[PDB]
Amino acid sequence: MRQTFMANESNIERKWYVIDAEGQTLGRLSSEVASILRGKNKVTYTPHVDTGDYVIVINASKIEFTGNKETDKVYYRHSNHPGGIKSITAGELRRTNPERLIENSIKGMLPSTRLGEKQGKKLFVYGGAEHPHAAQQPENYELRG
Amino acid sequence: AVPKRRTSKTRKNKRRTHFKISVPGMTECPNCGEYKLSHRVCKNCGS
Amino acid sequence: LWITRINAAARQHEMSYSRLMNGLKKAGIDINRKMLSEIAISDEKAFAQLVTKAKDAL
RNA sequence: UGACCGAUAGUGAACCAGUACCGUGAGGGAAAGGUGAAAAGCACCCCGGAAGGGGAGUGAAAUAGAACCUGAAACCGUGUGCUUACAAGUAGUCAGAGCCCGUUAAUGGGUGAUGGCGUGCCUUUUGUAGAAUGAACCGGCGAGUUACGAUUUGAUGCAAGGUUAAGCAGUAAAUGUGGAGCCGUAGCGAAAGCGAGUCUGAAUAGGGCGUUUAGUAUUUGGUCGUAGACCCGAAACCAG
RNA sequence: AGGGUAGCGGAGAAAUUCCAAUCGAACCUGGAGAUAGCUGGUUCUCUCCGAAAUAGCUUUAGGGCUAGCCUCAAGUGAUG
RNA sequence: GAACAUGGGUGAUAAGGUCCGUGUUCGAAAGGGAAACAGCCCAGACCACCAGCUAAGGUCCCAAAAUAUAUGUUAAGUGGAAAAGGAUGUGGCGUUGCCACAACUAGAGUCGAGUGACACUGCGCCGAAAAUGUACCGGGGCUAAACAUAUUACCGAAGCUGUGGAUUGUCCUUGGACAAUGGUAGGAGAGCGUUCUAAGGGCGUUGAAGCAUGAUCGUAAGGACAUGUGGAGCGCUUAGAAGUGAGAAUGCCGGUGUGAGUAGCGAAAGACGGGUGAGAAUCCCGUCCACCGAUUGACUAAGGUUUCCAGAGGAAGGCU
RNA sequence: GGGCCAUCGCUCAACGGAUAAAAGCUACCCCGGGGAUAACAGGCUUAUCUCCCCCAAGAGUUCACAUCGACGGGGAGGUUUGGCACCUCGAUGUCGGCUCAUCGCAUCCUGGGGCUGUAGUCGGUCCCAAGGGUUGGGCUGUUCGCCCAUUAAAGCGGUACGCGAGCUGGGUUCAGAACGUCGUGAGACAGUUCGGUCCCUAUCCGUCGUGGGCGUAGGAAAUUUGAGAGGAGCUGUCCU
RNA sequence: ACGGGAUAAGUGCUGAAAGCAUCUAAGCAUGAAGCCCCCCUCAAGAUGAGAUUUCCCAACUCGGUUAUAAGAUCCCUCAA
């Protein structure tokens, strides 16, 4: 119609970031990661192409939460079976498989489209062990707004 | 017990994807210039 | 769309869209949101100077 | 002879019609036109038991070969450009890469990786995405009409006047002739009656309807009356 | 096997049972395009204005008739 | 006729109950907010645009805009669903009084530092049990991203403004205007196309009507022009007359689909050898085996009306 | 005799008066219509209904708070009898029983308890607890209900008062009959009793099995890690 | 019918609001047929397509067409 730059393939470049959740409050460190994954921090962001970069966590066993949500806030799950309600994990599931805890939290703030599912596959969370992606030269983001 | 809706030309051609016949063995006769059936014999196919 | 693009190119200079716009109207400047975003994607130098003009006008 | 029909029309019947067919009987009652100017209706050869093909020949034409003028949709196939096996869908529309094209030449055309928005159509309802009704799809046919009257509006001609009917000599010419009649120019009262006034009644008094006068003939539109009266559909009643 | 009784008529050891797969009245043609205050249907395009679901009477109550509200053209022409 | 807000009757200060009265919206209203929601809040769409300012409601992510500032209130996830009550909950408002009141005890003396009824409160707490699956913050999640105030900034509709155009009704008396243009039952006005007639002028075997395709023209119904197929009629201008326009009536007739290679193929027991032929489980001959057996036997009558015999077949025919 | 003028008489009380001459039954009913209007199920409501509290009067010689519960008041539930008429009358078609289930907690059995007017076995009220169990017969059609004999126990409910395109047809509920009360009669009452046709070849989702195609950065054969998902879970007696 | 890891009603300990005292304001050990684990079966279409040992290896020219190799099938005799 007029003049409006539209980002496409073979014209955009993605990078690699590394955030640390040592003294974060999950939710606050999840909303700031979703924006980077969606690429809403660039001046050439289009809502029809995959724009943004990848994020990597290295401390998913240090995440904390204020209030009595560590004993409450239970997680439910069904298996499409008569009485398949699964709520074995509650708020103290940060000791057993804590990578899923952050994974779900950051995956619960993204669009449920065909492009919103492939944008959630650019995040790698680790309990406490170091990441094996040393050939990607990831930049240390750490500091959050 | 009666079709609620009518099928289209795409859903009807999708059901006829396996409806076909397989190729035969065609055991070429050794030397007679004919064709004998797999593990069989003919008046033309010598072998 | 333009608003989202201008808001992302205004956080790089430690500023906010709401604030940037407020100060851009106090300095008496008539510019479209489609043009502002078009300049940010192109000549970045121009945009940089504009921010300073709307920063001392607050 | 015709501002009548032209093969689902016009007779039920343009052809094998009151015929196929249906009923014990009274009775009911269809479908079906078209090779070419002239049969010159494919001599001959090849594949096949034959049917039917492929050459050849006849012809202006054989995709005019008796499934015979033209040959539209639904439906059924073969080739080919772009696209599709992690995906939730009234299937479109707005924005938009990549890969192919090239027009009635214009800010052209085909395909569509992704994003936003979005619960068919008709009828009946206070209200229908409705789990309320109707339609499998495509084509053809299928519902405010005419005759005679009444009232109102536009148009034109003549104007205190306006105009003819049935007739009669005529291109079934609808122009002449034809003055029985009709409307208007004066109303009021149950009437006799009087009359720019009249009835009222004991009253010229007060009141009611009149008086200050524009109509009329044909045609156009709207609505109504008598005919089936916008179209389709009953249980039932009577006669032979 | 040959005969007789016919539609408000006939037959009936009686059940609204039978009279050609038809019966609280059979079949065929005609009056006849019977009547239907009831349900369904009614075919091309644009422009301007734009309602009502109330009152009264009714063998009337899902029907009709006058008023109330809409539209068009004349008049009087500021009374709204 | 319906809901919402008020003023009453009736019923149980029951009902998305029912009957009147006064308003608004829906009906006949699209657009934005209330997660989805004819009647609730904001606001009335003549048409073009990848321009701007606002309304209700909002500004951590999904998802446009503050992880804004200053001040308090709240420890329950209260926010994000009920009541009589209950109480060593509380931030604010007043008391009352010991200079003892927490360990004294009558059912008397000390030491060292706050105690309580009552009154109005503001926010909490308990009272609080349902059947497919978390299960009313819309979801992830939040100690501020909650509540009560103040001031600001910005976002937000088809509302208003900017720029070009269409129609009206006005106006002035040639184009600037002035205003105006949601719409059902209805009323009024201006048009497009189909078949036939009249008059004038036309086209056509150097190819008419029809049919197929195309990226063309008009404000709509519509109209041209090339190209292929077709082989004899048909347009245009002005006026006239109508069997004048189709998507629905469990509409009438014809053609072709879907269900689907699906349901079915309706009385005795057959087996092999030879023959015929383009082709044989099915036709012809032969041998063995089996079934009916007061009958699937033999003969009169009713009824049907060449089905009877021989020779030749192209299929149609015969549930293969 | 009509007409103007002045009186008179019916009865139209269904009282704006159809012709001032108008009773019933259809279980044999027929056609046109309607969820504008009832019976079954869903939704709203909770008078009645079932729970939970509040004050405690009374019952225990003591102890109103072991237990019982006077009136009165405040709630929850939607499993009873009802109220309203919003979806369905171009059909949402049936009460018990049989077969097969699944969810709840307001707990019948088992379990963990404070407290008893609990010494012990036992048992009464309360609190937590939903994993799995929860019998065979006789009697009317019984969803009820009484009885017999057992058992660790024989709980209460929701799911169209679960389930008929999975079954039966006893109960209702159609045409034939008999008795009883009622009506002049045709009949009604459902008061009883005997006999009475239960239709359908699975297209789409869902579920139970079992294959073909392609994908995973070389192709192939065999053995495997386990993110997930299903199954299991009861209880008695004796020697001690 | 077992063995763990947590927990719910209760039970005490540390120790309070408000000096003495409550199992809560921080902690604590107990603590049930409930809930995770342990037992058994299916499980990388777990597009997040995993891991281990062994076997196989080209002429054209890299339009890839022609092709063979490990292996797989068609066809035949059969049943745990």
Side-chain angles (χ1 to χ4, degrees), chain A residues 1-87 89-91 93-112 115-141 143 145:
Chain A
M1 310 252 153
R2 279 282 63 194
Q3 37 253 45
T4 287
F5 173 72
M6 292 283 277
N8 64 351
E9 204 46 23
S10 84
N11 165 265
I12 59 202
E13 192 229 2
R14 323 204 176 74
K15 298 157 67 150
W16 287 79
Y17 289 149
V18 167
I19 325 203
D20 181 318
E22 254 203 342
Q24 296 330 312
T25 106
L26 184 67
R28 307 234 165 214
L29 149 152
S30 316
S31 36
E32 78 131 342
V33 159
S35 316
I36 305 164
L37 281 185
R38 285 205 68 210
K40 279 230 302 181
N41 288 337
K42 318 186 99 143
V43 295
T44 74
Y45 141 96
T46 67
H48 74 101
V49 331
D50 174 29
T51 34
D53 7 60
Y54 318 59
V55 187
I56 295 159
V57 197
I58 54 200
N59 274 320
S61 65
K62 306 263 126 212
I63 207 71
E64 322 117 278
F65 17 67
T66 83
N68 272 279
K69 54 186 24 151
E70 153 155 20
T71 304
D72 308 343
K73 173 168 201 29
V74 295
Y75 286 85
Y76 294 106
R77 179 172 78 273
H78 213 271
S79 61
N80 264 274
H81 264 87
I85 268 316
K86 298 273 192 295
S87 147
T89 56
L93 99 107
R94 158 198 38 201
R95 47 157 312 240
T96 61
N97 176 5
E99 300 107 313
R100 178 180 291 154
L101 177 69
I102 276 191
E103 208 167 86
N104 284 347
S105 167
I106 291 197
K107 278 212 205 193
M109 320 199 169
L110 275 181
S112 328
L115 163 60
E117 281 274 332
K118 96 186 282 274
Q119 261 180 341
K121 280 165 195 170
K122 299 180 335 220
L123 157 94
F124 314 87
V125 59
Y126 293 107
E130 282 353 78
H131 63 83
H133 311 279
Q136 321 298 171
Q137 310 163 63
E139 179 166 315
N140 167 271
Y141 207 94
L143 70 85

Side-chain angles (χ1 to χ4, degrees), chain B residues 3 7 12 15-16 19:
Chain B
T7 72
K12 159 191 88 153
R15 206 189 28 236
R16 297 168 182 179
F19 191 78

Side-chain angles (χ1 to χ4, degrees), chain C residues 3-4 7 11 16-18 22 25 32-34:
Chain C
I3 292 194
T4 285
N7 189 3
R11 250 142 212 282
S16 191
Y17 166 91
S18 89
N22 166 27
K25 164 205 75 168
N32 273 329
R33 281 152 184 77
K34 144 200 230 193

Side-chain angles (χ1 to χ4, degrees), chain B residues 1-31 33 35-41 46:
Chain B
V2 291
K4 189 119 191 116
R5 322 247 348 108
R6 77 176 216 192
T7 72
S8 42
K9 306 195 232 123
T10 167
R11 199 199 270 289
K12 159 191 88 153
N13 282 245
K14 265 182 200 250
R15 206 189 28 236
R16 297 168 182 179
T17 183
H18 288 123
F19 191 78
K20 64 203 301 211
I21 46 194
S22 30
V23 197
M26 298 154 322
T27 52
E28 296 236 88
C29 187
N31 264 152
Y35 234 145
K36 113 189 155 206
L37 294 105
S38 291
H39 286 78
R40 267 149 196 77
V41 81

